[PDB]
Homo-oligomer: A and B are copies of this chain.
């Protein structure tokens, strides 16, 4: 037997950083959860009990805190690239670093219509994520994403004209509820190294904001023919607005809300045009994915 692939590191490292502006007194907080996994010439730790090749996962944890102390932690694409590059430059036998970062929302509070200098609220479990793979001699590959964005529209969604055979019971509809949790990922063109990542720093926050805005606007305005059709429109717009993205991937659950027939009870009308009360379904759920790239 032989080691075909191996990676190891530290997962679930929670980090908080505060920035204090001495002039204005305004404080800004960042909180993230970080995972770092390494690859390289480490087979002998598995096959021969040779620990000499292991950078201890506890040391990786230390490195994350130290790196956050000495560098900006925003945008996460830059922080992840700094962190990944560190390991391949510092350790001769480590040849790849894989860095995953989940950014948690801490939104500045408005008290009496003005921004508070040092108080924050978690407005939703929506996350902004990055995956950074730093591979020696092959540059830096970055995938950025938003996830946990939960939306619903109560009309202007349709689903008709699908294949009907002996396995089909689903009725066609011209008016339904559509609700989903959005997971959207955009993959950047490969960067040659940290200098190139630094040169594009302004594009990271801007593209995240664009992806979010396009998602919300298209969802709200599209008279949706299907999840498939609507998500494609989203991806197409993002690719058109940022030339440095190669692909956009969406993964969307279709969270069903079922009509409840109440006609058995005193002829009560609660279906079709008369539908007011619905039963949200916890499971099963549709799952629809697509990856859109350039012609």
A residues near B, CB below 8 A? 1-19, 27, 29, 31, 35, 37, 42, 45-47, 49-59, 61-63, 65-66, 68-69, 91, 106, 109, 111-112, 116, 118-125, 149-156, 159-163, 165-170, 177, 216-217, 219-221, 225-229, 231-232, 235-236, 239-240, 247, 253-254, 257, 260, 262, 264-266, 268, 270, 275-280, 282-295
Contact = CB atoms under 8 A, between A and B. Distances in A.
Nearest to A239: B1
B260 A65 contact: yes
Which residue among A3, A46, A287 has the maximum number of chain B CB atoms within 10 Å of its CB?
Answer: A46
A159 B97 CA distance: 23
Contacts of A266: 166
Q: How many identical chains are in the complex?
A: 4
A239 to B, nearest CB: 5
Contacts of A112: 217
Contact of A121 (B57, B150, B260): B150
Given A8-B227, A8-B288, A18-B275, 14 more contacts: A4-B291, A5-B291, A6-B291, A18-B276, A27-B154, A27-B155, A51-B161, A56-B168, A56-B170, A59-B165, A62-B265, A119-B220, A120-B154, A123-B123
Given A4-B292, A262-B69, A169 B62 contact: yes
